[PDB]
Design a protein around this ligand. Structure first.
Ligand code: NAG
Lengths: 81, 50
């Protein structure tokens, strides 16, 4: 479940999965989002709406941010960033 | 014990078992609570608070 989303500005649509890769709701679902800035541009993110009511804990459900390139190397965080 | 495996012992698996599990409320009460708003609350931040 990997999609491209780059440019100068934009928004990652929440649970935007019934159009990209229509996954049935029953199974656990997870997806990653790839950002690319304008040449010579570090990026700042701001969350406009965040509510993971499925559980306070994340052994099932969570949202995280990765810096650098997309590896397990360095969790930026799992507030704005 | 042998060079190939150094982690073999009859009593390695069990350590100080004493009483099975724990007695009910031996060290911690069993307090119940309903989610009423200006009485109990989920903390503001979420992620470093599990
Ligand atoms: C050690 O090896 C023996 C023989 O396979 C096994 O029965 C025993 O459970 C093992 N114990 C540990 C600590 O690995």
């Amino acid at each position: 479940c990997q999609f491209e989303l780059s440019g100068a500005d934009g928004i990652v649509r929440s649970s935007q999965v019934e159009q990209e890769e229509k996954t049935k709701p029953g199974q656990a679902v997870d997806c990653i989002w790839t950002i690319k800035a304008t040449p010579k541009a570090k990026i700042y993110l701001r969350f406009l709406d965040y509510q993971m009511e499925h559980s306070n804990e994340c052994k099932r459900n969570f949202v995280a941010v990765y810096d650098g390139s997309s590896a397990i190397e360095n969790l930026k965080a799992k507030n704005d960033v | 014990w042998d060079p190939a495996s150094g982690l073999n012992m009859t009593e390695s698996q069990k350590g100080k078992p004493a009483n099975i599990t724990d007695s009910l409320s031996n060290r911690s009460l069993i307090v119940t609570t309903i989610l009423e708003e200006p009485y109990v609350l989920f903390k503001k931040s979420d992620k470093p608070l599990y």
